[PDB]
Amino acid sequence: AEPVYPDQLNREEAQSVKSNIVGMMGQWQISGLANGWVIMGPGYNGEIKPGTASNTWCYPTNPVTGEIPTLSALDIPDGDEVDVQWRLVHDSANFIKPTSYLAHYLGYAWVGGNHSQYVGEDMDVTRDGDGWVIRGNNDGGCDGYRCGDKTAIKVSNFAYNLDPDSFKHGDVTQSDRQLVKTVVGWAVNDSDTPQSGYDVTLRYDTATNWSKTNTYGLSEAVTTKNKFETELSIEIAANQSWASQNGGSTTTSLSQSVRPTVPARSKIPVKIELYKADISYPYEFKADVSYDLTLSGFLRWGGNAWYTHPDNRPNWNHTFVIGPYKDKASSIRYQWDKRYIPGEVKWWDWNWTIQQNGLSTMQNNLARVLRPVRAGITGDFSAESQFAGNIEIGAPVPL
Amino acid sequence: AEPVYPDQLNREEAQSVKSNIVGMMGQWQISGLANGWVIMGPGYNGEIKPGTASNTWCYPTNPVTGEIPTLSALDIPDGDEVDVQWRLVHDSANFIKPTSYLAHYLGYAWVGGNHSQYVGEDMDVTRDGDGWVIRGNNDGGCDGYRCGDKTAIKVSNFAYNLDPDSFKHGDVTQSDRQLVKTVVGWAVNDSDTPQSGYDVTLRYDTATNWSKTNTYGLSEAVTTKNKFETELSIEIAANQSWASQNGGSTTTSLSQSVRPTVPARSKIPVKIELYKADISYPYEFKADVSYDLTLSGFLRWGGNAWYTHPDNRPNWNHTFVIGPYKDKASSIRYQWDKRYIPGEVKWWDWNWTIQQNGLSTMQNNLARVLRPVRAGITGDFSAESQFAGNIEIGAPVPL
């Protein structure tokens, strides 16, 4: 009838979340529900049958949805892309601690450095290629099984959601200009009315292609020979062959046209030019910063949140998208909202994290992890071997 | 929290520039910072731990950004491209000395001639192909290890940023004209209204292509023969083959059309012609002159600014772009502004140059190297085997 969330705890509603109810009770115990039905615990394999007992299950008269709250946006002082990234990853209260706690709650081992006993303390930050890496400091020494195998938090693939009325760009400059082709010409009007029916068009195209082929074959031959000085021989033969091909191509095209309106009893000159050149220009906008978050390290033997709950301390890697929806495996909100359907629990078990830490705890942590970020952006565009053109209509000459 | 620039000198802020702080202190020394944390010097490998000591690190209460200043533009008397280049490279106060000092500060050996002891003096200037070369004069003799291996400063790849309302061009002339094709025709209107539904179009296309193929193969055969006068033999065989192809093409197209409006009960004649010809014309504009600067010579054993600090006197080459941003390796402003992030110091160490010469010194030198230049330009366009066309609508004839 209604969706039921196990953290809040009808024969059907009981069946819909059967494995959660059966998990949360003693072996050989029996507890009741509506209309004379009872749930049997482990050892009876969770069987639901008509019956009676001295314990019962029941929902709150007024239960809650348990959704992740939305916080106000975090404003980062303006700059270029790398400066804004620097300011985000070095913020311990708004970035480093919430992310460390998320990794800890999901079951990643050793989230922290050697100079503190607390989660998220004593972390080092470094720049690595186009991304950033946050890991606990490992100077001196530690004490614990595999205590030198720290969990790493990796940040990459930043993207920007612009505000439509904020974008601006500056001067466009060109360098290393090379000529492709030019055309010049005249449009002549010896009639008594204006004429607009003229057209000159110049077009340039380039393309590439590839192909691969596999061939297989068989043949059979029979020869009979008779040496009557004179030998006479006759050969009969046949063959079969099969072949298979795959391929493809890519094409780029650039066209320019001119269509002048010419006054009566007059003529107009025209010109079109095409070059290749490198293009550069500055820009600015205001936007929201989204990114990919990857957690990497071995999981804990005493318990973790992976839905198969492995116990051999495997090394683990998983990527979440902090921002708009792309996919199910990488969406925290998708997985949180659907925790009432056992058939979709394919990645992380969020019911387990609620049981271990409390509902308010998990809600506040996830709200901080998913908080929006605002920042101003300045930057520079640059590209090699692009196109540049020029189309001209000149002044008329009376005939 | 905040970016910290080492020339101006929190446990995190301390970690963000750890290698600069540790470099700038004595082995086995320990100095303090905020909230009970201390930095250990070389020999402790820079370890940051809780503790105490008799020395401390601290930032200025009011530190500076240290950005490179912008100077007013240098005006060069007008001419053509080569005359303006000549005037730029022969200016010792605005060009030769600042560039020589930049090469000297980065660690290039022997920047100067044999008739002076000062940097940038006694330099010769020569024209070489499409560029210019500036090098210290090596007449007579010198005194020093490899003192005859002078550092060279090379200038090439000039580009112009026009002022939109300044461009003008003159007469367009043609020579070596060869006919491609012509068409003539009539548009006839025997209706009682004007008609504009007429079209004649002439189009000419040319193209080239190429392709390469690699093929490999295997075969196996078995023959049985029996010589019962009569020999009978039977052959069974099979084969396999694999092939791979790559290719491409280029196409150029030029089209011309005519669409006349014809009065009622009248006719109009039309004509289209297409030629190949060489095209020439004069031009003028006002613009800014940008260029590529290349430094070439062996580096100094006692210290240089390359980030790996090599000590075997290698021969070195590096190109900077003086002008708008293209890339990171060739941008002085990009590298200067990001000197607070150790993970991006991949080319020249600008913190090292500041430590060796002072901050005001480096700022003034780089401001002079990057100063804008304004100049007027006159010139001539020339190209072979271009297109030229002519489209004509004639006077009407009553029917």
Author numbering:
A (entry chain A), B (entry chain B): 1 to 9, 27 to 245, 252 to 422
Reproduce passages from the article:
Aerolysin is a β-pore-forming toxin produced by most Aeromonas bacteria, which has attracted large attention in the field of nanopore sensing due to its narrow and charged pore lumen. Pore-forming toxins (PFTs) are important virulence factors of many pathogenic bacteria, which are secreted in a soluble form and upon host membrane binding, they oligomerize into transmembrane pores undergoing a complex structural reorganization. Domains 3 and 4 form the 120 Å long 14-stranded β-barrel, with each protomer contributing two antiparallel β-strands. Four distinct constriction rings, two at each end of the pore, were identified from the structures and confirmed by MD simulation.
We have recently demonstrated that the K238A mutation enhances the sensing capabilities and sensitivity due to a longer dwell time of the analyte in the pore. To unravel the structural basis for this improved performance, we have solved the structure of the K238A mutant in SMALP obtaining a density map at 2.2 Å. The structures of the WT and mutant in SMALP are highly similar, exhibiting an RMSD of 0.92 Å and comparable pore cavities shown both from the raw structure and in MD simulations. Upon closer examination of the mutant structure, it becomes evident that the K238A mutation induces widening of the third constriction ring. This is attributed to the substitution of lysines with smaller alanine residue. In contrast to previous suggestions that the K238A mutation alters the analyte dwell time by decreasing the diameter of the constriction formed by R220,13 these structures reveal that all other constriction rings remain unaffected. Notably, for this mutant, we did observe a narrower water density from the MD simulation at R220, which is the same as previous MD results. The new structures indicate that the K238A mutation may influence the pore’s rigidity as it disrupts salt–bridge interactions between K238 and E258 within the barrel. A comparison of the ionic current response to different voltages revealed that the MD simulations in DPhPC bilayers based on the new K238A aerolysin structure solved in SMALPs yielded results that very closely aligned with the experimental data and are better than previous estimations, especially when negative voltage is applied.
